[PDB]
Amino acid sequence: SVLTQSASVSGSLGQSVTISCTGPNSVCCSHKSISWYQWPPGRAPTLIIYEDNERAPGISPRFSGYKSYWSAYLTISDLRPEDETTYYCCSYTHNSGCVFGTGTKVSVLGQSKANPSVTLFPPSSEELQANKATLVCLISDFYPGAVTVAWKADSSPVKAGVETTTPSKQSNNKYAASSYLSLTPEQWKSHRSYSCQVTHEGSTVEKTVAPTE
Amino acid sequence: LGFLGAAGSTMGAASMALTVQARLLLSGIVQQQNNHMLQLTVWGIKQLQARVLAVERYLRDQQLLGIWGCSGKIICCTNVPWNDSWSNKTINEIWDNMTWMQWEKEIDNYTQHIYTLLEVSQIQQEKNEQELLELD
Amino acid sequence: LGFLGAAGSTMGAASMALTVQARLLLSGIVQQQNNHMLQLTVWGIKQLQARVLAVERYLRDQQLLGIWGCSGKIICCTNVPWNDSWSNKTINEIWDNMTWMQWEKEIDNYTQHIYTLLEVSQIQQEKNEQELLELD
Amino acid sequence: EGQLVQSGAELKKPGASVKISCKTSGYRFNFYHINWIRQTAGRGPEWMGWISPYSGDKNLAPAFQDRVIMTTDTEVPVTSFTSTGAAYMEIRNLKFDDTGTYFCAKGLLSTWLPYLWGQGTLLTVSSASTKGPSVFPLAPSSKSTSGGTAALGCLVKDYFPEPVTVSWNSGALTSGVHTFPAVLQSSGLYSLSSVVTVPSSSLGTQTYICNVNHKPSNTKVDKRVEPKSCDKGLEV
Amino acid sequence: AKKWVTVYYGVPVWKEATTTLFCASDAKAYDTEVHNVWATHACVPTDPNPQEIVLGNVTENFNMWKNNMVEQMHEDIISLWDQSLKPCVKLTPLCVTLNCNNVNTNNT
Amino acid sequence: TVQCTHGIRPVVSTQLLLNGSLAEEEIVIRSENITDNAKTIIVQLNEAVEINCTRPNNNTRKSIHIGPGRAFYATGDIIGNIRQAHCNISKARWNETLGQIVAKLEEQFPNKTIIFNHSSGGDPEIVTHSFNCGGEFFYCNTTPLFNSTWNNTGEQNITLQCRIKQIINMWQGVGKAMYAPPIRGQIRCSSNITGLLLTRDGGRDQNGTETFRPGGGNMRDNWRSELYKYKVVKIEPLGIAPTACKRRV
Ligand SMILES: *[C@@H]1O[C@H](CO)[C@@H](O[C@@H]2O[C@H](CO)[C@@H](O[C@@H]3O[C@H](CO[C@H]4O[C@H](CO[C@H]5O[C@H](CO)[C@@H](O)[C@H](O)[C@@H]5O)[C@@H](O)[C@H](O)[C@@H]4O)[C@@H](O)[C@H](O[C@H]4O[C@H](CO)[C@@H](O)[C@H](O)[C@@H]4O)[C@@H]3O)[C@H](O)[C@H]2NC(C)=O)[C@H](O)[C@H]1NC(C)=O
Ligand SMILES: *[C@@H]1O[C@H](CO)[C@@H](O[C@@H]2O[C@H](CO)[C@@H](O[C@@H]3O[C@H](CO)[C@@H](O)[C@H](O[C@H]4O[C@H](CO)[C@@H](O)[C@H](O)[C@@H]4O)[C@@H]3O)[C@H](O)[C@H]2NC(C)=O)[C@H](O)[C@H]1NC(C)=O
Ligand SMILES: *[C@@H]1O[C@H](CO)[C@@H](O[C@@H]2O[C@H](CO)[C@@H](O[C@@H]3O[C@H](CO)[C@@H](O)[C@H](O)[C@@H]3O)[C@H](O)[C@H]2NC(C)=O)[C@H](O)[C@H]1NC(C)=O
Ligand SMILES: *[C@@H]1O[C@H](CO)[C@@H](O[C@@H]2O[C@H](CO)[C@@H](O[C@@H]3O[C@H](CO)[C@@H](O)[C@H](O)[C@@H]3O)[C@H](O)[C@H]2NC(C)=O)[C@H](O)[C@H]1NC(C)=O
Ligand SMILES: *[C@@H]1O[C@H](CO)[C@@H](O[C@@H]2O[C@H](CO)[C@@H](O[C@@H]3O[C@H](CO)[C@@H](O)[C@H](O)[C@@H]3O)[C@H](O)[C@H]2NC(C)=O)[C@H](O)[C@H]1NC(C)=O
Ligand SMILES: *[C@@H]1O[C@H](CO)[C@@H](O[C@@H]2O[C@H](CO)[C@@H](O[C@@H]3O[C@H](CO)[C@@H](O)[C@H](O)[C@@H]3O)[C@H](O)[C@H]2NC(C)=O)[C@H](O)[C@H]1NC(C)=O
Ligand SMILES: *[C@@H]1O[C@H](CO)[C@@H](O[C@@H]2O[C@H](CO)[C@@H](O[C@@H]3O[C@H](CO)[C@@H](O)[C@H](O)[C@@H]3O)[C@H](O)[C@H]2NC(C)=O)[C@H](O)[C@H]1NC(C)=O
Ligand SMILES: *[C@@H]1O[C@H](CO)[C@@H](O[C@@H]2O[C@H](CO)[C@@H](O[C@@H]3O[C@H](CO)[C@@H](O)[C@H](O)[C@@H]3O)[C@H](O)[C@H]2NC(C)=O)[C@H](O)[C@H]1NC(C)=O
Ligand SMILES: *[C@@H]1O[C@H](CO)[C@@H](O[C@@H]2O[C@H](CO)[C@@H](O[C@@H]3O[C@H](CO)[C@@H](O)[C@H](O)[C@@H]3O)[C@H](O)[C@H]2NC(C)=O)[C@H](O)[C@H]1NC(C)=O
Ligand SMILES: *[C@@H]1O[C@H](CO)[C@@H](O[C@@H]2O[C@H](CO)[C@@H](O)[C@H](O)[C@H]2NC(C)=O)[C@H](O)[C@H]1NC(C)=O
Ligand SMILES: *[C@@H]1O[C@H](CO)[C@@H](O)[C@H](O)[C@H]1NC(C)=O
Ligand SMILES: *[C@@H]1O[C@H](CO)[C@@H](O)[C@H](O)[C@H]1NC(C)=O
Ligand SMILES: *[C@@H]1O[C@H](CO)[C@@H](O)[C@H](O)[C@H]1NC(C)=O
Ligand SMILES: *[C@@H]1O[C@H](CO)[C@@H](O)[C@H](O)[C@H]1NC(C)=O
């Protein structure tokens, strides 16, 4: 990618934020019209700017554009919780195809410490029947998007029973992550007291469920 | 560009050629020569009744341009502001996207209220201000 | 203000609203839909003969405004001086006192001599001076 | 605002020819241009090409010339403005760098640019064989009995390759359901689950049946929530 | 950015409606046959150059069975059929008593 | 967009259409209504099927005056042998045109269900191919056509039961009736087949029997194979559009 973005921009709720997008003197932001996009990975992207200063119909007047002798930028006055996502820029003409940027990551701070609906699922009469020993942990709306996965097989150091994922952006504009346990019934029967340790600043009301009852 | 030869094309390209749409509108390929010894036949009655409806559609809009100061030309602006409540789309947006075709179906509703407002700010106010402003 | 809704009111208030008097003058509440299988009945003949007399009264005055440079608007002044011998009353006086009603009965006499003079000073002299004055 | 219908879950081994389709609905498909784009694993979206459905004009990237060849059909009018059409995309001699999400976009009128996108087609250009999801129902949660609300759902052990659509009682239970993020394991296989928060004071007279679907492995396996409770949550 | 009303004349927009039409016919026999029942002596003539303008991007819904031009053609011909032969010989007193036989040969 | 239509000839016939639009490469099915059998269906042909029409009845001129001035002209004397009008048609050409008619109805109507029969009931003018030719009105038969029953998809002597009629108050003239005058000598055709008119098969529920015949009794539908491509519109030249510009003093 030749057209570069600010890569990592941080802002706060109800405060103005600006993203500095700069390109080389070949695909420079001087003659080419520039456009911005709100692209959440996996979801459908939304057109923010369709022509430098002009916004796409339906898009809030909070968003504004500016174009210099080679670089283009985007200003977002009064930040909202839905805004934290990876953005993309575009350089184009009425003769040629679109030019795409590297991508800038936006973190909208100021949000409250959202307590998650943490649930630990033990193996049922069907999960144990198919000879599969598993223990999963759900996490829903836990802002910030920081995760701390820790398994306790009789409160001993776990090496083999570790399976972590990437915390994806949830519907409430917060975060959602996944944690799995891939073990055979042999290594599973050697330990019985299975404690779930999820470190998020707060209280100690964690759901500790035994796989054997 | 042809009679209605810009209807398909967007508003921007439609406003580019709209004189032909008014040129062949009256005496084009329908006027003709207009040539038992009597002209009281079924074709004679049908041609003269159609002639009345022909001028009626022209004069209705012709009178409006005359009472707007837009009589002298095809395209002439007015001193009337656009109430945002009527249409919320960008000026440049409908001109290369919506086209006159769909656009008439959008205004037709407030079109009479628009005509009412067009008469006063541009003529009943502007031309009535002249009475005192002409000599000073 | 209504069709002729300013006739009662003085010239000043009559000149204030005179667009409605020309608006409902043609296609208002008389135009309609204009809808044995034949349309040669007593109502068909009466409507088309009335249509001829309808345009005749409009076009007679419409041609005059066109040959005075006043075609573009409702109210437009001319470069014709008023011969005091025609009317001796003050400009502001008839506008809040005499009213258009009695005023037409005062001019009607020299009205044709007025129309004759209106053609030359404003068009036969003013627009004919342009032929040489347009390029200099 | 117009809705696009993007055909998904199609994928194959490297070198083979991939065919991706998209149905256009509720707009004038004729004068509205069509744009095609893809995004790699390295967060760098590569603009593939631009195509016109009214005229034969096209603009394509040099990296997608000999490999990518596109085609379009005639518009099917519904009203005096609305129409229905479709665009096809053929890619030849694919690599593991071509693996990613492929999107279809609706035109604007400065017109060459898009306006609205589709759902998404996650293309997996891998030589490895297809695996069918191992659907297993989950025992009651470790929440409460106060009012009834308590979590209950299902778990999908192993399958290969994504995307996988999972619903509850065939498009009936959509609210109060969380879709767990499906992520790859150490062996190179994806894994997911589903959690539903319904008022369950005691197991009885309620719908616990779900729906699992796949394209390269066509799945039918649907298992309901375990009555033989293995948790303290649905007890006290 | 400061939206002001602009008046445009000659806008290419149509509204679905039906009006009174008229003839368009070329010179036929001219010398021998001068007036045939339909065209009569005075029919509105046709132009050799018709407006062949085709409108791209226009998918107008046509009404085949609910077309109002069809009803116009229905009334024009019958009214003309009643008009034609009006100035001709009335066979009102012709209809009288009728006595007969068949042919000189028995149906061969 | 046209200001002048096609060369539409005022068709004066029932059963068969004589002039006009012939939309090519397939036979066009004009559907006013089709799901319900009850309503009429007009069918446009792809290629013209030429039809000869003669009348070898050779008649002289007899004029008898009714009162003052008025002259009445009637059939004089027939010179030669007694014979029928004689329209004539091809055998194979028609069969070939019917070939795509039966194939199209298999697509429109369900499967290969039983579908054949002749003109039901009616007066002479309604059930026979009543048409003006050279002057006189010909009343030829529509029986040798619907004689073919098929499911899976100069010239030859084919004629119909030809009969002449002079007393004609066409389209049922309850006020002014017309007497057709005879034509002295030669009778030629130089005409065409530009379509046809069909009908229902009662109100049968479901079934395997839906026998179709010619029962189109309307003159309006005869021009519906001509004005199918036409629709009149009112032009609106006045247009109001906002843009960044205004007027001053
Ligand atoms: C679709 O529409 C068309 C409209 O064009 C329908 O056309 C049918 O065309 C035929 C064939 O022409 C008509 O029959 C005859 O037309 C003749 C044309 O004559 C002209 O030239 C004459 C020169 O005279 C010499 O040659 C003619 C050749 O026919 C001899 O008959 C004649 O004895 C001479 O040897 C001129 O004198 C004449 O006036 C024309 O300028 C006519 O000649 C012929 O008419 C006879 O009777 C007439 C009655 O007034 C009389 O005036 C003529 O003088 C003459 O004696 C005859 O009409 C069909 O009538 C015509 N109609 C139909 C419905 O078939 C086409 O059919 C139609 N339908 C479709 C496609 O289905
Ligand atoms: C051509 O015209 C037809 C007219 O029939 C039109 O389609 C019709 O649409 C109506 C919609 O209401 C259909 O009505 C129902 O069809 C069902 C299914 O067969 C019947 O079970 C119904 O029975 C009713 O009527 C009975 C008789 O009175 C009653 O006894 C009973 O209680 C019900 O009230 C009813 O018929 C109708 O069937 C169709 N016609 C069909 C399918 O033949 C059609 O749209 C037109 N097509 C075009 C556009 O060419
Ligand atoms: C005039 O402009 C206004 C204000 O922008 C329009 O009113 C409302 O605008 C909002 C824009 O956010 C519309 O919301 C839309 O909802 C749909 C469906 O959920 C969504 O897809 C869009 O992205 C957007 O969020 C809202 O529907 C609209 N309300 C209505 C019913 O009018 C207004 O419509 C514009 N012009 C008109 C036609 O009056
Ligand atoms: C005036 O503005 C309205 C705002 O939308 C435009 O449309 C309105 O639409 C509704 C719903 O379609 C109309 O209701 C009608 O009901 C009849 C019942 O027979 C039905 O046949 C129609 O299809 C329609 O559903 C409503 O009449 C219509 N108008 C108003 C004033 O509310 C409308 O186009 C605008 N323009 C005009 C010319 O009024
Ligand atoms: C045009 O202005 C002239 C001159 O002012 C008018 O002509 C004459 O004007 C005098 C004004 O002093 C009139 O005299 C009046 O006499 C009556 C009755 O005795 C008296 O009540 C008034 O106070 C005044 O003194 C005179 O009648 C009038 N002459 C005529 C017959 O016209 C002239 O009339 C004005 N306009 C017209 C209508 O031409
Ligand atoms: C032209 O200026 C005159 C000046 O006053 C205006 O009125 C004129 O008034 C006299 C007297 O009223 C008219 O005599 C008429 O005699 C007939 C006889 O039948 C009688 O019926 C009338 O009532 C009237 O007494 C005279 O005709 C009239 N006109 C002229 C030219 O002297 C007159 O209104 C002004 N306007 C016009 C339209 O001429
Ligand atoms: C109209 O009448 C003609 C006969 O006068 C029918 O024509 C014949 O139709 C049949 C079957 O539809 C044809 O049969 C095929 O012949 C080919 C020759 O190679 C053969 O390969 C096929 O297996 C089959 O036998 C036949 O050629 C054709 N010709 C004849 C005998 O004249 C025509 O079908 C009738 N109209 C209809 C029913 O649509
Ligand atoms: C189509 O052509 C066929 C040619 O044979 C006609 O077929 C048969 O015509 C007879 C005499 O009208 C019908 O007879 C009737 O049978 C019923 C049976 O219950 C009886 O109740 C009556 O009293 C009478 O005897 C016979 O049904 C009929 N067969 C059929 C159904 O095709 C046929 O009628 C022609 N279709 C029409 C009328 O267009
Ligand atoms: C009935 O339909 C047929 C369609 O086959 C019509 O046939 C065409 O009639 C025209 C005259 O109206 C012929 O035009 C002339 O052809 C000759 C011979 O080559 C040529 O030298 C002249 O320059 C002229 O173009 C046309 O060829 C003929 N087509 C064929 C080959 O069948 C027929 O006119 C229709 N009958 C009517 C109008 O009543
Ligand atoms: C009907 O047939 C008769 C028999 O030939 C034709 O009669 C001829 O008419 C011409 C016209 O002048 C005469 O000169 C011949 O002498 C007649 N021949 C005889 C012996 O009758 C007649 O022409 C035919 N039909 C019509 C109406 O022309
Ligand atoms: C163009 O007009 C169509 C008409 O429905 C509309 O749907 C589309 O959003 C418009 N695009 C813009 C924003 O100009
Ligand atoms: C107003 O007009 C009347 C009409 O007769 C007249 O009598 C009166 O004197 C006028 N007043 C003035 C001087 O404006
Ligand atoms: C046609 O000919 C047949 C066979 O002679 C005869 O039965 C029938 O009456 C004629 N007419 C009609 C209208 O079918
Ligand atoms: C019937 O008309 C066709 C078309 O001209 C012709 O070829 C045929 O020879 C005619 N019939 C006779 C008398 O042979």
UniProtKB/TrEMBL annotation, chains B, C:
Residues 46-64 are annotated as: Immunosuppression. It is found in: Virion membrane; Host cell membrane; Host endosome membrane. This is Transmembrane protein gp41. Residues 1-13 are annotated as: Fusion peptide. Glycans are attached at residues 83, 88, 97, 109. Residues 11-136 form the Retroviral envelope protein GP41-like domain. The chain crosses the membrane at residues 1-18. Disulfide bonds join 70-76. It comes from the Viruses. Residues 105-136 form a coiled coil. It is a single-pass type I membrane protein.
From TrEMBL, chain F:
Transmembrane protein gp41: Acts as a class I viral fusion protein. Under the current model, the protein has at least 3 conformational states: pre-fusion native state, pre-hairpin intermediate state, and post-fusion hairpin state. During fusion of viral and target intracellular membranes, the coiled coil regions (heptad repeats) assume a trimer-of-hairpins structure, positioning the fusion peptide in close proximity to the C-terminal region of the ectodomain. The formation of this structure appears to drive apposition and subsequent fusion of viral and target cell membranes. Envelope glycoprotein gp160: Oligomerizes in the host endoplasmic reticulum into predominantly trimers. In a second time, gp160 transits in the host Golgi, where glycosylation is completed. The precursor is then proteolytically cleaved in the trans-Golgi and thereby activated by cellular furin or furin-like proteases to produce gp120 and gp41. Highly glycosylated by host. The high number of glycan on the protein is reffered to as 'glycan shield' because it contributes to hide protein sequence from adaptive immune system. Belongs to the HIV-1 env protein family. The chain holds residues 253 to 509 of 860 of the full protein. This is Envelope glycoprotein gp160. It is found in: Host cell membrane; Host endosome membrane; Virion membrane. The gene is env. HIV-1 lineages are divided in three main groups, M (for Major), O (for Outlier), and N (for New, or Non-M, Non-O). The vast majority of strains found worldwide belong to the group M. Group O seems to be endemic to and largely confined to Cameroon and neighboring countries in West Central Africa, where these viruses represent a small minority of HIV-1 strains. The group N is represented by a limited number of isolates from Cameroonian persons. The group M is further subdivided in 9 clades or subtypes (A to D, F to H, J and K). Inhibitors targeting HIV-1 viral envelope proteins are used as antiretroviral drugs. Attachment of virions to the cell surface via non-specific interactions and CD4 binding can be blocked by inhibitors that include cyanovirin-N, cyclotriazadisulfonamide analogs, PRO 2000, TNX 355 and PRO 542. In addition, BMS 806 can block CD4-induced conformational changes. Env interactions with the coreceptor molecules can be targeted by CCR5 antagonists including SCH-D, maraviroc (UK 427857) and aplaviroc (GW 873140), and the CXCR4 antagonist AMD 070.
